[PDB]
Amino acid sequence: GAMGSEPIEAIAKFDYVGRTARELSFKKGASLLLYQRASDDWWEGRHNGIDGLIPHQYIVVQDTEDGVVERSSPKSEIEVISEPPE
Numbered sequence: 732g733a734m735g736s737e738p739i740e741a742i743a744k745f746d747y748v749g750r751t752a753r754e755l756s757f758k759k760g761a762s763l764l765l766y767q768r769a770s771d772d773w774w775e776g777r778h779n780g781i782d783g784l785i786p787h788q789y790i791v792v793q794d795t796e797d798g799v800v801e802r803s804s805p806k807s808e809i810e811v812i813s814e815p816p817e
Contacts, residue, residue: 732796738777739765739799741790755783763790768805 743761747754755778757763763785764777776785792803 732794732798734796734798739802740793741765741774741776741785742793743789744791745789747786747789749783753784755781755785757785757789765792766802768803770805 741763743757743759743763746758747756749756755763755776757778761778765774765785766777766782767775769775769784772787774785774787774790776783778785
């Protein structure tokens with residue numbers, strides 16, 4: 732960064748094969764884009780034009796901004812319930 736509002740970059744450090752239809756598959760060295768931390772183990776992100784889930788333990792997130800703290804932390808309950816559903 733500074734990244735402002737843009738998605739965070741990460742690189743795959745290990746190969747990963749997706750085990751469900753929601754999960755991205757990628758090879759070590761791949762460039763990944765991260766939109767939002769879903770949980771300690773998982774991100775919502777993008778690889779090769781396709782949005783899906785990416786496991787935290789298979790990647791290295793690139794440095795800096797904060798900023799990134801919002802996208803890097805899972806959304807809290809109180810944040811989600813602050814607005815009605817669509």
